[PDB]
Design a protein around this ligand. Structure first.
Ligand SMILES: CCCCCCCC/C=C\CCCCCCCC(=O)OC[C@@H](O)CO
Ligand SMILES: CCCCCCCC/C=C\CCCCCCCC(=O)OC[C@@H](O)CO
Ligand SMILES: *C/C=C(C)/C=C/C=C(C)/C=C/C1=C(C)CCCC1(C)C
Ligand SMILES: *C/C=C(C)/C=C/C=C(C)/C=C/C1=C(C)CCCC1(C)C
Ligand SMILES: *C/C=C(C)/C=C/C=C(C)/C=C/C1=C(C)CCCC1(C)C
Ligand SMILES: *C/C=C(C)/C=C/C=C(C)/C=C/C1=C(C)CCCC1(C)C
Ligand SMILES: *C/C=C(C)/C=C/C=C(C)/C=C/C1=C(C)CCCC1(C)C
Ligand SMILES: CCCCCCCCCCCCCCCCCCCC
Ligand SMILES: CCCCCCCCCCCCCCCCCCCC
Ligand SMILES: CCCCCCCCCCCCCCCCCCCC
Ligand SMILES: CCCCCCCCCCCCCCCCCCCC
Ligand SMILES: CCCCCCCCCCCCCCCCCCCC
Ligand SMILES: CCCCCCCCCCCCCCCCCCCC
Ligand SMILES: CCCCCCCCCCCCCCCCCCCC
Ligand SMILES: CCCCCCCCCCCCCCCCCCCC
Ligand SMILES: CCCCCCCCCCCCCCCCCCCC
Ligand SMILES: CCCCCCCCCCCCCCCCCCCC
Ligand SMILES: CCCCCCCCCCCCCCCCCCCC
Ligand SMILES: CCCCCCCCCCCCCCCCCCCC
Ligand SMILES: CCCCCCCCCCCCCCCCCCCC
Ligand SMILES: CCCCCCCCCCCCCCCCCCCC
Ligand SMILES: CCCCCCCCCCCCCCCCCCCC
Ligand SMILES: CCCCCCCCCCCCCCCCCCCC
Ligand SMILES: CCCCCCCCCCCCCCCCCCCC
Ligand SMILES: CCCCCCCCCCCCCCCCCCCC
Ligand SMILES: CCCCCCCCCCCCCCCCCCCC
Ligand SMILES: CCCCCCCCCCCCCCCCCCCC
Ligand SMILES: CCCCCCCCCCCCCCCCCCCC
Ligand SMILES: CCCCCCCCCCCCCCCCCCCC
Ligand SMILES: CCCCCCCCCCCCCCCCCCCC
Ligand SMILES: CCCCCCCCCCCCCCCCCCCC
Lengths: 212, 210, 209, 210, 210
């Protein structure tokens, strides 16, 4: 419907407020400093993404779908590095109970990440063909997730986390190719999973809320 | 009419109250299990408060029907958190540990979203309103049957179960009514189901009442 | 003029009171004091919200409408204020913030009887004189019940007395025309919410000799 | 006009700074007396920042005389808090306990409000400005006489007492000026009397300066 | 065209990020010297975010020269905090105590305000643009000479000193450029000088990198 399109913006916006609140409160109370650092970063992701969604929502009346998708890049440029830092710190917490990563390794991750995003952007503004942007983008994505895989030690949380990021982030590249309207809706739903459900997972995991 | 406006403000203002009370106690309780429950409760008030502020802001720009359709977005976010709180509280009251089996929680959510989804489909004409009611209440039955299996008897658990049972059933009753009185009813139900329940959790864990 | 200033004075004092109780609620090592200051913070939060609304409207709305709107604020703040009062009595008498729920429900019943009958009088469903008479009957029940929970001591007596007088004065100002009644209620809120809030903070913080 | 615009924004932004720094430290200091002082200082910034945001929002329909009259509502709230901070600071500097006699503080407030009240009556013409100045300054003297009696000799106490005496006296001096320079002067005095004093307390108790 | 507007949003949103991260760690670190640094860092993000929200508000009908003039108010508040952080950071890295001589800090501020003030006179045409450039950079030299004397050698201090040196000098470079490129340059420099520096402090004290 016209309804469900607008609803997708609100759903993600409100779930970002939920995720931001839950990680904020636990970041302020966890006794584990490494968990605090992860939950602190996670709060920042929700804060930033919520800001951009509030902008999008403020423009719904005369919505320009293409404009919105281009604006998302500003959000992505800020949140993707934070999300990736969280991922690699979490790998290490799961292995050694300390949040640490080599800065050099992290800069290589970011290089691949920004190659991926920058290529996507060049395609959207027509500096390169969209088709080329897609393939070159996915190549950088491959470099990103290969490098990520080298920092991962095998265990249930690390495998789920890696697998979730792999699939969710790949789907951005899939939705990239769609028309502006369905692309927006897909991205809204992907953000709900990649930011909010991931954040809620981190909280629930460290809080030991669930028995498997 | 005027009823609509006052009832919106009442619930909105009480959500601020509930959110503040649970936030402060989440940050200061020495019991981590209570923190998790009160943290979740704070999320509920934050999300609902956002929706109420939006409804109030748009009151002269949207109709009663649209507001009721929009509530589903709020419900889609708040109902799962509320149910998580419920089942976590069940265990906290028994063992002082906030845990539930993820599989049990996913079954709870399945029933919850069948309830909400079939209600929504009836509301938008995809199925007959009356089927919305029947299927909704059938899923409601599944939901509370499953909740009951995780309820262990004690005073608090029984009160909580009963309160949820009655309040949540009443949403299905007000679903029957015309758009205006339905809005007012939902406003008041939210006051009870989110705000007064949230204050109960606070007061219960704070040992405010004998 | 000073009718608009009175709105700002109370609004700004609510911000002060809310800030002061918030920070101390978050730092006190006494859990009972935390519960009381937590509730006090809520009172300031809610009343501040309604005052920001009244202020946003001073051009667009008549003074009767503002007074009727206050009942929504009152319906929320009064039960929290009463809960604080009985918990404070209890803290003085037992070092613990507790009350019997049944006792609190009786208190709330009297309170809403009082507010409800007052409201009915304000909107003309019953006469103003009947609103006052029934209102004060419920007021009497309320303050009678409150007194049965009160043990004698400096703080409990000061508190009980403060509430008794300040709350009776709402019923006094109820008799006035709409404009002075607004100024009156603004000043009473400053006392009943803000100065009481500040009292609790100062008392538990042992700021004064 | 520009001068007064820029000076509004300067003080407003510095109030945000001061409120943030005292807020965070009030929440973490292990000294309860310092907490009370920093809590109070936070309130001062919150209130004054509210009023400055108001002045700023009024700029496009600005009435300089109106701004100066509105300041009295701010002063009526912030001055008692500032004075309470001052006398508690005196005591902390000697016994490390934030306490004062209620009766002493009520006398302080009596003088403070005589001062503000008579100044106000002069501004709105109930009495002549000159009579406002004379009464105002007499109340100022009573206030600072009483303040001085609660003051123990001490490096911090002396700097504080002197800073307050001078800065507060200057409000009475700018009261005499035409509305424009009066506003700019008040904006800068507020910067010193609220913000710089607030940052002093933080820095002093945090021991960041040798 | 897009990139210019985007540069405001990037820095604004990164300020929100930096403010959040230092706020949470300020409230939880067990080292109070680190708290004081992170407290100050939070203030910087709060103040700059306020001004960036203002600029973003003005993008439709944007006057590039006005914005750059407006920035001086931001600068007048944030630069002294940033310099305080820098010198406390020097000491914390060497002694693990956040302390500086007040006299040293006032000399630093003298130079800092000489730099900003002369730069401002150049912009508003009271002195020629190349003059402001030359004199401003003289004060900058004084500032960074003095800072260097407070610096003791080590990895973090050398990095911090070099980053501040280069970034702050670059404000002087972009000062020569036309209003539009100058805005974009300042937006990016603020990202580095406030946000990336603040994130560095957080990461450094949290020891998340090796
Ligand atoms: C909605 C998305 C939230 C998904 C979160 C559900 C996964 C939680 C889990 O697997 O439990 C981890 C425990 O073993 C840790 O003690
Ligand atoms: C992107 C923002 C730039 C942040 C740069 C972060 C570098 C922090 C670092 O060098 O680690 C310090 C170690 O010695 C462990 O404490
Ligand atoms: C919260 C926002 C997130 C996690 C955004 C992630 C964005 C991507 C993973 C984009 C990926 C792309 C490709 C893999 C191909 C090229 C086009 C892109 C940039 C959409
Ligand atoms: C805070 C909001 C809450 C707790 C909403 C709960 C909503 C329901 C329990 C809705 C129930 C319904 C039925 C039981 C029948 C079908 C129609 C519904 C969805 C209104
Ligand atoms: C913060 C607001 C407060 C404490 C409001 C209290 C309001 C009352 C005590 C009203 C009392 C009334 C009567 C005692 C008689 C009838 C009229 C009323 C409702 C104003
Ligand atoms: C934050 C605001 C402050 C500290 C305001 C203080 C105001 C005064 C000290 C005003 C003093 C006056 C006199 C001493 C003479 C009469 C006129 C007054 C009210 C301006
Ligand atoms: C967050 C904002 C910051 C760190 C601003 C710093 C501003 C400067 C370092 C300005 C320097 C200038 C000169 C060195 C000479 C030319 C004029 C100035 C003021 C732009
Ligand atoms: C609206 C964004 C969600 C709020 C959750 C974060 C809690 C506040 C932290 C400060 C962020 C600014
Ligand atoms: C040894 C470090 C190598 C870093 C290479 C990639 C750096 C690019 C960082 C991304 C910025 C866009
Ligand atoms: C690398 C992602 C490109 C999208 C544009 C980001 C905006 C940068 C502002 C300068
Ligand atoms: C070995 C485990 C592999 C699991 C892959 C799962 C991919 C599912 C993608 C859905 C994302 C759900 C979000 C969960 C947050 C973690
Ligand atoms: C007319 C609008 C059509 C919108 C099509 C987009 C549908 C939503 C995309 C679903 C993505 C879900 C990803 C979850 C995987 C785990
Ligand atoms: C509009 C507020 C409704 C809920 C109040 C929640 C209390 C604060 C939540 C923390 C966010 C920072
Ligand atoms: C126990 C197996 C898990 C049951 C899956 C049901 C989850 C449905 C959630 C609906 C969301 C739309
Ligand atoms: C196990 C129960 C599954 C319920 C299906 C209903 C899901 C509705 C999705 C919207
Ligand atoms: C001890 C209480 C447990 C009761 C759980 C049973 C829930 C049944 C709810 C009634 C089902 C409604 C079916 C109506 C069809 C339309
Ligand atoms: C006390 C001195 C200030 C007088 C004027 C400002 C306060 C106005 C409050 C309105 C009175 C009710
Ligand atoms: C909206 C809930 C915010 C909780 C913090 C309370 C701070 C008190 C300020 C009250 C005045 C607004
Ligand atoms: C045993 C006494 C319990 C009496 C309950 C009081 C009924 C009044 C309820 C009013 C709440 C609105
Ligand atoms: C025995 C206690 C009786 C107190 C309850 C009084 C009920 C008053 C009605 C208020 C509802 C409006
Ligand atoms: C709690 C102190 C704040 C209220 C101010 C007092 C005004 C009401 C008069 C109280 C009467 C006391 C009883 C002796
Ligand atoms: C009506 C005049 C009263 C003025 C008293 C002034 C007292 C100042 C203290 C010396
Ligand atoms: C207490 C620090 C506040 C700084 C403000 C300085 C304003 C100058 C006041 C001069 C008084 C000096 C003491 C004699
Ligand atoms: C065009 C308006 C110009 C009038 C400027 C008058 C402002 C005087 C500056 C205030 C100085 C007081 C600060 C003293 C600190 C000790
Ligand atoms: C609520 C006290 C101020 C702390 C702010 C912490 C979050 C950073 C704010 C950046 C501005 C957006
Ligand atoms: C637009 C005017 C900016 C001039 C730059 C120099 C700033 C001097 C004023 C200092 C005010 C802040 C006091 C700390
Ligand atoms: C104008 C320049 C002022 C003088 C700058 C002195 C530089 C001191 C040595 C710096 C060492 C750099 C390490 C990074
Ligand atoms: C851009 C021109 C700068 C000339 C002055 C250099 C002196 C500063 C020393 C470093
Ligand atoms: C980044 C290196 C640290 C600063 C060293 C000082 C550089 C002096 C250059 C001044 C003239 C160009
Ligand atoms: C050695 C200085 C080189 C300047 C690099 C500028 C990048 C700043 C990053 C912030 C880290 C502090
Ligand atoms: C108009 C173009 C001006 C660009 C200024 C470049 C500085 C930022 C580089 C990234």
């Amino acid at each position: 419907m016209s309804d469900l399109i607008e609803y997708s913006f609100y759903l993600t916006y409100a779930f970002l407020m939920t995720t931001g609140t839950i990680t904020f409160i636990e970041a302020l109370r966890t006794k584990n400093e490494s968990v605090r650092h992860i939950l602190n970063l996670e709060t920042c992701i929700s804060v930033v993404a919520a800001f951009f969604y509030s902008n999008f929502i403020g423009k719904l009346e005369h919505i320009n779908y293409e404009e919105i998708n281009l604006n998302r890049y500003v959000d992505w440029a800020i949140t993707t590095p934070i999300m990736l830092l969280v991922l690699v710190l979490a790998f290490r917490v799961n292995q050694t109970n300390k949040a640490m990563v080599k800065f050099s390794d992290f800069m290589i991750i970011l290089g691949m990440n920004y190659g991926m995003l920058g290529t996507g952007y060049l395609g959207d503004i027509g500096v390169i063909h969209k088709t080329m942007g897609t393939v070159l983008g996915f190549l950088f994505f491959g470099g990103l997730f290969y490098k990520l895989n080298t920092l991962r030690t095998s265990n249930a949380s690390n495998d789920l986390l890696y697998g979730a990021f792999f699939v969710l982030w790949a789907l951005y590249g899939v939705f990239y190719q769609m028309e502006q309207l369905p692309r927006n809706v897909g991205y809204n739903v992907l953000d709900l999973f990649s930011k909010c459900f991931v954040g809620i997972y981190f909280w629930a995991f460290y809080a030991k809320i669930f028995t498997l």
